[PDB]
């Protein structure tokens, strides 16, 4: 009569898509979008799963991060899809081990224009745009 819980699970998409008219930027075979509507870090999974088809919350590897930051603005921050699973450090929906500054947080990760690594924030309820990806 009050609250309902929805255990949602998220994975990387198996299909191929790229909106050539509305993408934020593109690198290799992946088209990256910045959500125009700000969201929380947890909501970014659903927000990216529904911006465009075959799109999900992406975590930037050291080689993609400079491009993401170059497509960013001075005062703009961006939630990134790097999450913790205990040991084995931080990872993404694409797998791999990420270098994450985890001193002042352990849950949500974001990047700015001048961020050199993904940085974990102490509060995940902040409203920042999401970084979504779709392979071409």
């Amino acid at each position: 009569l009050h609250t309902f819980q929805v255990p949602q699970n998220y994975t990387k998409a198996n299909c191929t898509y790229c909106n050539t008219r509305e993408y934020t930027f593109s690198y290799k075979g992946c088209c990256f979008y910045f959500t125009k509507k700000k969201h929380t870090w947890n909501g970014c999974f659903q927000a990216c799963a529904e911006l465009y088809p075959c799109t999900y919350f992406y975590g930037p590897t050291p080689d993609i991060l400079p491009v993401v930051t170059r497509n960013l603005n001075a005062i703009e921050s961006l939630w990134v899809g790097v999450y913790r699973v205990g040991e084995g450090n931080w990872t993404s929906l694409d797998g791999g081990t990420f270098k994450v500054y985890q001193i002042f947080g352990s849950h949500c990760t974001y990047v700015s224009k001048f961020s050199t690594v993904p940085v974990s924030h102490h509060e995940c309820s902040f409203l920042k745009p999401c970084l979504c990806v779709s392979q071409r």
Partner: antibody, heavy 120, light 108 residues
Amino acid sequence: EVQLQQSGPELVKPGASVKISCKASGYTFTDYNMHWVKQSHGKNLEWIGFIYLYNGGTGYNQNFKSKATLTVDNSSSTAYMELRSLTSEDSAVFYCARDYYGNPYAMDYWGQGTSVTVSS
Amino acid sequence: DIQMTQTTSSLSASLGDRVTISCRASQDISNYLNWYQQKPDGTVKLLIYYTSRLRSGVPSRFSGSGSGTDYSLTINNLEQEDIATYFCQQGNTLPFTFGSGTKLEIKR
């Protein structure tokens, strides 16, 4: 410009307390962390601690926990540091520092410094 | 327990020369090293962050390099405004720690 204005020089009796102030300016207060560092003698710097400007959460160096207390006034955009039980070894210059946005391992803006003298 | 050791406490060089200040960490700090400059009036401003990233506004005469435990800050074409003390600072773990500092004096 001046964006991090610190309090003036303070002279405190041994064993007493002191409240150093650090006023903010040109930036959104609740998006950063405020660090406090101690410079004793004429060079040696010592990181005292930090405070989350949003919720007021704090973190301290273990050599400063029973001396420093960090507080924040969100509406006035101020960060306060209370030092207690000051001995003649605490005569030093205390700095407040706003960290780099997106790089919290670095402090990109510093105060002018507040000199605290402890003597009878 | 990460300690920062500065190899030198005082450096002397002429105008237009090149000075290199070195810092050493007791353990790997994964490039989380910053270089700050404190001038005689006590004003401190961050020159370099993340080993080599030059903060916007600082002249390109300042540069950084290093890895693991060894890091270095280089000032090329020494100017009279560079008379100051230079500190290294690791941010890899808490508590943050600083180096002893290196005072740069102009030799004439």
